[PDB]
Scaffold this active site. Sequence first.
Site, PDB file in Angstrom:
ATOM      1  N   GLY A  24       0.886  -1.197   0.023  1.00  0.00           N
ATOM      2  CA  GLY A  24      -0.040  -0.017   0.069  1.00  0.00           C
ATOM      3  C   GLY A  24       0.941   1.160  -0.072  1.00  0.00           C
ATOM      4  CG  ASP A 135       4.332 -11.309   2.599  1.00  0.00           C
ATOM      5  OD1 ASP A 135       5.206 -11.576   1.736  1.00  0.00           O
ATOM      6  OD2 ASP A 135       3.682 -10.370   2.413  1.00  0.00           O
ATOM      7  NE  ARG A 139       7.164  -9.171  -0.222  1.00  0.00           N
ATOM      8  CZ  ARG A 139       7.942 -10.278  -0.820  1.00  0.00           C
ATOM      9  NH1 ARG A 139       8.785 -10.559  -1.547  1.00  0.00           N
ATOM     10  NH2 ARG A 139       7.113 -11.294  -0.590  1.00  0.00           N
ATOM     11  CG  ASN A 140       7.268  -7.948   4.110  1.00  0.00           C
ATOM     12  OD1 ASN A 140       6.724  -6.960   3.651  1.00  0.00           O
ATOM     13  ND2 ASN A 140       6.634  -9.230   3.447  1.00  0.00           N
ATOM     14  CG  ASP A 153       3.276  -6.672   5.060  1.00  0.00           C
ATOM     15  OD1 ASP A 153       2.036  -7.256   5.432  1.00  0.00           O
ATOM     16  OD2 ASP A 153       3.691  -5.804   4.321  1.00  0.00           O
TER      17      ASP A 153
HETATM   18  C1  LIG Z   1       2.975  -3.545  10.033  1.00  0.00           C
HETATM   19  O1  LIG Z   1       3.927  -2.487  10.592  1.00  0.00           O
HETATM   20  C2  LIG Z   1       3.599  -1.282  10.141  1.00  0.00           C
HETATM   21  C3  LIG Z   1       2.771  -0.453  10.972  1.00  0.00           C
HETATM   22 CL1  LIG Z   1       1.844  -1.128  12.012  1.00  0.00          CL
HETATM   23  C4  LIG Z   1       2.684   0.894  10.184  1.00  0.00           C
HETATM   24  C5  LIG Z   1       3.406   1.507   9.212  1.00  0.00           C
HETATM   25  C6  LIG Z   1       4.353   0.638   8.788  1.00  0.00           C
HETATM   26  C7  LIG Z   1       4.677  -0.797   9.220  1.00  0.00           C
HETATM   27  N1  LIG Z   1       5.555  -1.468   8.603  1.00  0.00           N
HETATM   28  C8  LIG Z   1       6.377  -1.145   7.247  1.00  0.00           C
HETATM   29  C9  LIG Z   1       7.161  -0.356   7.081  1.00  0.00           C
HETATM   30  C10 LIG Z   1       7.734   0.704   7.810  1.00  0.00           C
HETATM   31  C11 LIG Z   1       7.908   0.465   9.253  1.00  0.00           C
HETATM   32  C12 LIG Z   1       8.102   1.571  10.135  1.00  0.00           C
HETATM   33  N2  LIG Z   1       9.232   2.294   9.622  1.00  0.00           N
HETATM   34  C13 LIG Z   1       9.405   2.375   8.265  1.00  0.00           C
HETATM   35  C14 LIG Z   1       8.675   1.683   7.386  1.00  0.00           C
HETATM   36  O2  LIG Z   1       9.078   1.842   6.171  1.00  0.00           O
HETATM   37  C15 LIG Z   1      10.348   1.704   5.612  1.00  0.00           C
HETATM   38  C16 LIG Z   1      10.043   1.682   4.121  1.00  0.00           C
HETATM   39  C17 LIG Z   1       9.283   2.757   3.297  1.00  0.00           C
HETATM   40  C18 LIG Z   1       8.680   1.906   2.269  1.00  0.00           C
HETATM   41  C19 LIG Z   1       9.274   0.513   2.448  1.00  0.00           C
HETATM   42  O3  LIG Z   1       9.580   0.323   3.529  1.00  0.00           O
HETATM   43  N3  LIG Z   1       7.510  -0.493   5.581  1.00  0.00           N
HETATM   44  C20 LIG Z   1       6.920  -1.505   5.097  1.00  0.00           C
HETATM   45  C21 LIG Z   1       5.986  -2.059   6.248  1.00  0.00           C
HETATM   46  C22 LIG Z   1       5.107  -3.301   5.746  1.00  0.00           C
HETATM   47  O4  LIG Z   1       4.265  -3.505   6.441  1.00  0.00           O
HETATM   48  N4  LIG Z   1       5.278  -3.680   4.599  1.00  0.00           N
HETATM   49  C23 LIG Z   1       6.371  -3.335   3.730  1.00  0.00           C
HETATM   50  C24 LIG Z   1       6.744  -2.035   3.646  1.00  0.00           C
END
Ligand SMILES: COc1c(Cl)cccc1Nc1c(-c2ccncc2OC[C@@H]2CCCO2)[nH]c2c1C(=O)NCC2
Length: 302
Positions: A24, A135, A139-140, A153
Amino acid sequence: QALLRILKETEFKKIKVLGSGAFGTVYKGLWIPEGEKVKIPVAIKELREANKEILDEAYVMASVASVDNPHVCRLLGICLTSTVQLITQLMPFGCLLDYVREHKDNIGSQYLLNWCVQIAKGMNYLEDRRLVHRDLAARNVLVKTPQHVKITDFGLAKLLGAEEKEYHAEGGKVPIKWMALESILHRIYTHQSDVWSYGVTVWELMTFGSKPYDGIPASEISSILEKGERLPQPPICTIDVYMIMRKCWMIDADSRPKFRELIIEFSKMARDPQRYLVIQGDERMHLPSPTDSNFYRALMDE
Ligand SMILES: COc1c(Cl)cccc1Nc1c(-c2ccncc2OC[C@@H]2CCCO2)[nH]c2c1C(=O)NCC2
Ligand SMILES: [Cl-]
């Protein structure tokens, strides 16, 4: 007992997009809760074309909150706006897949093996809480610091009942190149199918973010796996490291390693990392650390 904290939209400031994709949209922001008056860097996740799908994710994450494991992402709460949003602590160094691709020239043996230990410790914790991730991939996995990574994720994650050993999936899109054979053929998911995915995740790290089965369509994978073909040995990997990956990709699920075994073997390797991974200029490589006096430089830059 799953408790969802509801965070006010008005308590978030300087919200900016980090990236988009299959997960997303993720934003970074500053959460200032009223009363405490402290600025907490947070990541914000939403889908754009159900609000149902993201609440299932929040449930699963809330359900395994009883114990604080340092290698699994904590839900701080949700936010109700134009969409339903998940909220977590910002992982400032971002996604581990992107990180291994960008910092290839300064990633030494100690880092790669420590990451493998920390992901195995995270999955072991999730197995104890009866959680099948479904998953697990580079990437996760996210980077709090270059020394500290967390699993994220839980959009496909399923909690097994006290009696249940496996989850049977319905018709839903799934990451074929990360999945065990029995998941592709029979839509069966266990802790041991997560071990297969762990194997692929390790291969991704040891190749500094190579695409698994590159140029091969997802429909040929099960036939390739049935012929006994697997992902190739990374150039830096000694035989013991590659044998762990090949043990994760065995046809018999129960013959695959357990996470508790993977923790110990990757820990043994982390005590003599140059024996197990061969990287040119390993001793001349460096990545920012919290112990560094100038670590505040890296946090602000990234
Ligand atoms: C499920 O935990 C989350 C929650 Cl509760 C809220 C916001 C982000 C996440 N986790 C994720 C981050 C994330 C969490 C914390 N800090 C930075 C983050 O993103 C970093 C980069 C930016 C885009 C790809 O990852 N990035 C990704 C997830 C995800 O759930 N799937 C793949 C990409
Ligand atoms: Cl795929």
